[PDB]
């Protein structure tokens, strides 16, 4: 049985009187006060600590006439997905932005729709008469829906044109490597 | 036991062509083809020992079947076990 003494032997320096002087009472104290922290910390600190954050956002939602009883459920309605630890940062350091979330939920704005499961592109229901040089109607369907989305993300140099960029030639950028 | 007497149903006809139900035994059993197949002491094939190097063909297939590089000698030429007087020893 190994009491990790050399891991506690130098840490009695912050205990109080009798514990620092003697060792077999110094360890016994800290190896308990340590043994209860890491038991308090795993199973008990959160469901206390995460109740200060709830008591904060509540009484900060309470200032605007709403409760936590109504805000906690009117957020998940709007698919808004802000963990309570964050709403407590907004309750304090960004009050206006928080009340923006407040005035949003109370509003009768249609919450976003649930995401649509994957759909069947209707070209799967045609049988391409297989010619070597023509693409399958379901590929040039997928591609155009993947290139229009690559031109969608970020201001770049890629055929930089105002608003929507050039596509009908982007799909045929292989011929530019052809001889 | 009393046997099978007080004979069979005691009917007769030209039809008389629908029954077998041999007493189980007279159906590959008391036609004693091979029940000793399970009840006869085996005569074991040649046994490889530390001293007695008796080869066996039954095992040699389980090597002749394998996909082994470094092929094996044919069995007959692997045998130490086959004209003065019909050929000397």
């Amino acid at each position: 049985y190994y009491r990790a003494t050399a891991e506690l032997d130098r840490l009695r320096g912050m205990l109080r009187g009798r514990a620092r002087l003697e060792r077999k009472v110094g360890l016994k104290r800290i190896t308990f006060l340590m043994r209860t922290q890491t038991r308090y910390r795993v199973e008990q600190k959160a469901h206390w600590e995460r109740a200060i954050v709830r008591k904060n956002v509540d009484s900060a939602a309470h200032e605007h006439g709403s409760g936590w009883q109504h805000l906690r459920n009117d957020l998940a309605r709007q698919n808004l997905m802000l963990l309570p630890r964050t709403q407590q940062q907004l309750a304090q350091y960004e009050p206006l932005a928080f009340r923006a979330v407040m005035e949003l939920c109370a509003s009768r704005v249609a919450p976003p729709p649930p995401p649509m499961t994957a759909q069947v592109p209707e070209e799967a229901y045609a049988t391409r008469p297989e010619d070597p040089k023509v693409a399958h109607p379901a590929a040039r369907r997928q591609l155009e829906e993947c290139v229009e989305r690559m031109l969608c993300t970020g201001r770049s140099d890629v055929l930089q044109r105002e608003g929507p960029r050039t596509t009908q030639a982007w799909m045929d950028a292989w011929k530019e490597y052809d001889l | 036991m009393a046997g099978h007497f007080n004979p069979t149903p005691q009917a007769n006809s030209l039809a008389a062509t629908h029954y077998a139900h041999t007493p189980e035994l007279r159906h590959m059993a008391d036609g004693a083809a091979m029940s000793l197949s399970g009840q006869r002491i085996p005569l074991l094939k040649p046994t490889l020992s530390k001293w007695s190097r008796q080869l066996r063909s039954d095992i040699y297939d389980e090597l002749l079947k394998l996909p082994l590089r470094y092929a094996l000698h044919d069995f007959r030429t692997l045998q130490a076990h086959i004209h003065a007087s019909s050929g000397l020893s």
Binding site: - | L48, R56, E62, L63, L66, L68, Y70, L72, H73, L78
Partner: protein, 59 residues
Amino acid sequence: PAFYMRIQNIEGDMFRFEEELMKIFPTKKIFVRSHSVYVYNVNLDGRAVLHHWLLGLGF
């Protein structure tokens, strides 16, 4: 009654030897060591399979 074999007198590359036992016993754990080649869970019938092979190889 749980047995293993030991192939003790071999020289060469045991691995090109042991890679020819695997094709025989695709299910017995075979370990290679400097002098020997241990093959596990194979009893005196496996002893008989080897020599019918070590004779076929010509040794």
